[PDB]
Design an enzyme around this catalytic site. Structure first.
Site, PDB file in Angstrom:
ATOM      1  N   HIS A   1       1.628   4.217  -2.915  1.00  0.00           N
ATOM      2  CA  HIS A   1       1.660   5.650  -2.623  1.00  0.00           C
ATOM      3  C   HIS A   1       2.982   6.278  -3.065  1.00  0.00           C
ATOM      4  CE1 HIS A   1      -2.191   6.084  -0.946  1.00  0.00           C
ATOM      5  NE2 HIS A   1      -1.950   5.729   0.303  1.00  0.00           N
TER       6      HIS A   1
ATOM      7  N   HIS B   1       0.831  -1.204   0.000  1.00  0.00           N
ATOM      8  CA  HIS B   1       0.000   0.000   0.000  1.00  0.00           C
ATOM      9  C   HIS B   1       0.867   1.257   0.000  1.00  0.00           C
ATOM     10  CE1 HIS B   1      -3.554   2.505   1.230  1.00  0.00           C
ATOM     11  NE2 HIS B   1      -2.593   3.217   1.791  1.00  0.00           N
ATOM     12  N   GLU B   2       1.775   1.355   0.974  1.00  0.00           N
ATOM     13  CA  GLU B   2       2.627   2.534   1.059  1.00  0.00           C
ATOM     14  C   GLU B   2       3.574   2.629  -0.130  1.00  0.00           C
ATOM     15  OE1 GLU B   2       1.614   4.509   3.262  1.00  0.00           O
ATOM     16  OE2 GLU B   2       0.385   3.044   4.334  1.00  0.00           O
TER      17      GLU B   2
HETATM   18  C1  LIG Z   1      -5.676  -1.846   9.759  1.00  0.00           C
HETATM   19  N1  LIG Z   1      -5.511  -0.404   9.795  1.00  0.00           N
HETATM   20  C2  LIG Z   1      -6.233   0.428   8.850  1.00  0.00           C
HETATM   21  O1  LIG Z   1      -6.947  -0.075   8.049  1.00  0.00           O
HETATM   22  C3  LIG Z   1      -6.060   1.946   8.877  1.00  0.00           C
HETATM   23  C4  LIG Z   1      -7.386   2.660   9.148  1.00  0.00           C
HETATM   24  C5  LIG Z   1      -8.354   1.801   9.962  1.00  0.00           C
HETATM   25  C6  LIG Z   1      -8.089   1.526  11.441  1.00  0.00           C
HETATM   26  C7  LIG Z   1      -8.931   0.787  12.134  1.00  0.00           C
HETATM   27  C8  LIG Z   1     -10.174   0.207  11.463  1.00  0.00           C
HETATM   28  C9  LIG Z   1     -10.406   0.447  10.189  1.00  0.00           C
HETATM   29  C10 LIG Z   1      -9.430   1.303   9.385  1.00  0.00           C
HETATM   30  N2  LIG Z   1      -5.558   2.363   7.579  1.00  0.00           N
HETATM   31  C11 LIG Z   1      -4.149   2.651   7.384  1.00  0.00           C
HETATM   32  O2  LIG Z   1      -3.389   2.550   8.288  1.00  0.00           O
HETATM   33  C12 LIG Z   1      -3.650   3.078   6.004  1.00  0.00           C
HETATM   34  C13 LIG Z   1      -2.540   2.135   5.548  1.00  0.00           C
HETATM   35  C14 LIG Z   1      -3.091   0.720   5.401  1.00  0.00           C
HETATM   36  C15 LIG Z   1      -4.024   0.665   4.194  1.00  0.00           C
HETATM   37  C16 LIG Z   1      -1.929  -0.243   5.176  1.00  0.00           C
HETATM   38  C17 LIG Z   1      -3.095   4.500   6.041  1.00  0.00           C
HETATM   39  C18 LIG Z   1      -4.097   5.436   6.710  1.00  0.00           C
HETATM   40  S1  LIG Z   1      -3.218   6.825   7.478  1.00  0.00           S
HETATM   41  C19 LIG Z   1      -2.725   6.352   9.160  1.00  0.00           C
HETATM   42  C20 LIG Z   1      -3.329   5.262   9.934  1.00  0.00           C
HETATM   43  C21 LIG Z   1      -2.666   5.152  11.296  1.00  0.00           C
HETATM   44  C22 LIG Z   1      -1.666   6.118  11.431  1.00  0.00           C
HETATM   45  S2  LIG Z   1      -1.467   7.122  10.080  1.00  0.00           S
HETATM   46  C23 LIG Z   1      -2.835   4.963   4.608  1.00  0.00           C
HETATM   47  O3  LIG Z   1      -3.740   5.146   3.864  1.00  0.00           O
HETATM   48  N3  LIG Z   1      -1.474   5.175   4.155  1.00  0.00           N
HETATM   49  O4  LIG Z   1      -1.235   5.599   2.838  1.00  0.00           O
HETATM   50 ZN   LIG Z   2      -3.015   5.213   1.981  1.00  0.00          ZN
END
Ligand SMILES: CNC(=O)[C@H](Cc1ccccc1)NC(=O)[C@H](CC(C)C)[C@H](CSc1cccs1)C(=O)NO
Ligand SMILES: [Zn+2]
Length: 414
Positions: free
Chosen positions: A26, A22-23
């Site tokens: 990005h 994912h990252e």
């Molecule tokens: C399992 N964790 C997630 O799914 C969270 C959001 C979430 C949390 C709890 C329940 C449902 C969703 N998503 C992410 O961490 C994204 C990266 C994942 C896709 C690998 C991240 C979102 S940003 C931040 C999240 C925490 C600190 S900064 C992103 O988009 N980076 O480009």
């Molecule tokens: Zn993301």
């Protein structure tokens, strides 16, 4: 104790791969657009790996991979001089930010594609389309369909699974008068059975197979052994690989089903059988053992000779298309799951399928309009507000298909 070690290792691998890709989507959309990133952090907790490349991006890894981020350049988050000013995220166009925030969630999807494209290429284990019961007084009964046989093909269309069989049947029922089914009975060479489907129209409620009279089930065959386990009741009783059980307790058998009937229903009691070993009728006595999951079931420790499953091999682009199909299926599945709110495989293949499914789930949940998420930003830009190539690409691929079939007719008689 390797249970916990192994499951934790697999879970860490899965989460790390998903978050890292994912990252990385990005960061790759950032790098291939001039928008220079700033930090590439993967996971939660105490950083353990921190590397700076040529530009200045700080790739950081953490031991708890429940989420990562890729921070870029903002005039509120930082400040760079004119040297790298037109490479800031906020200074760039609002048009590029749409593709930037969509990089991650799509990446997961893409990953699933590859993963599925990886598992359909190598092979996958499916159950044989084996008919075990022919219904009395039906369409398959008028044709005297072979009770106990494996369906090889329907209307020439080869079938290697159950879903293939049901699809080939449903597709050619109301399209013509009859249906030819190539099927292989037990101990016999394959043969064709003709089903007269002209008069029968449609059944509003009922299984589309019971409407024809095809009952499916477990695969059967001769009472021949292909595998015998160590320290099994069969090994102690003298059962060998290649033996064919001819009779059990005076009653002669002819199917694996009858042998398993004698085995499961008499645990701890000795059975005196006669087997055909190397053209010799030989008497043995074996005592089934109480099964671990159910003491009612008798356990002997044998595997049948005949093959039970099928493996489907796919090419390159066919497997890619099948992977796209399965990814879309997973998308619709998680969609219906969210709407609610308001199969024995062969090793690591199952782990890759689970990886791809969880990747689809993550790419779907992180693409919703929520506070701080990629889908939140995609919604943020949605309610805020080329074709030449669109036609040329389909023109080119159509010409490619035509030329490929031209070469196929010659480079690729009764
Ligand atoms: C399992 N964790 C997630 O799914 C969270 C959001 C979430 C949390 C709890 C329940 C449902 C969703 N998503 C992410 O961490 C994204 C990266 C994942 C896709 C690998 C991240 C979102 S940003 C931040 C999240 C925490 C600190 S900064 C992103 O988009 N980076 O480009
Ligand atoms: Zn993301």
């Amino acid at each position: 104790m390797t249970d916990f070690l192994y499951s934790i290792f697999g879970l860490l691998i899965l989460l790390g791969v998903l978050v890292t890709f994912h990252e990385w989507g990005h960061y790759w959309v950032a790098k291939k657009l001039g928008v220079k990133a700033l930090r590439f952090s993967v996971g939660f907790g105490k950083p353990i790996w921190g590397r700076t490349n040529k530009h200045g991006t700080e790739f950081v890894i953490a031991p708890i991979p429940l989420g990562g981020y890729v921070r870029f350049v903002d005039e509120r988050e930082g400040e760079v001089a004119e040297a790298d000013l037109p490479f800031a995220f906020n200074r760039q166009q609002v048009w590029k930010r749409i593709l930037i925030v969509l990089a991650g969630p799509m990446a997961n999807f893409l990953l699933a594609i590859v993963v599925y494209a990886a598992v359909y290429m190598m092979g996958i284990a499916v159950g044989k389309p084996f008919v075990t019961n022919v219904l009395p007084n039906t369409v398959a009964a008028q044709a005297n369909f072979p009770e106990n046989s494996e369906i090889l093909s329907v209307d020439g269309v080869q079938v290697k699974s159950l879903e293939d069989a049901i699809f080939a049947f449903v597709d050619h029922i109301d399209d013509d008068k009859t249906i030819k089914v190539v099927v292989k009975p037990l101990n016999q060479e394959p043969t064709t059975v003709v089903l007269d489907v002209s008069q029968w129209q449609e059944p509003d409620e009922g299984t589309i197979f019971d409407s024809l009279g095809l009952g499916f089930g477990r695969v059967n065959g001769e009472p021949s052994l292909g595998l015998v386990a160590k320290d099994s009741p069969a090994e102690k009783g003298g059962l060998k690989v290649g033996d064919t059980v001819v009779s059990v307790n005076g009653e002669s058998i002819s199917l694996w089903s009858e042998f398993v009937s004698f085995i499961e229903n008499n645990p701890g009691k000795p059975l005196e059988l006669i087997v055909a070993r190397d053209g010799y009728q030989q008497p043995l006595v074996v005592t089934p053992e109480a099964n671990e999951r159910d003491r009612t079931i008798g356990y002997l420790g044998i595997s049948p000779a005949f093959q039970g499953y099928n493996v489907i091999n796919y090419g390159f682009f066919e497997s890619f298309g099948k992977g796209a199909e399965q990814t879309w299926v997973m998308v619709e599945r998680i969609g219906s799951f969210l709407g609610k709110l308001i199969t024995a495989q062969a090793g690591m293949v199952a782990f890759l399928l689970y990886l791809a499914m969880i990747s689809v789930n993550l790419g779907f949940v992180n693409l919703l309009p929520i506070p701080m998420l990629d889908g939140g930003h995609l919604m943020y830009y949605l309610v805020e507000l080329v074709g030449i190539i669109l036609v040329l690409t389909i023109m080119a691929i159509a010409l490619f298909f035509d030329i490929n079939r031209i070469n196929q007719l010659e480079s690729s008689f009764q």
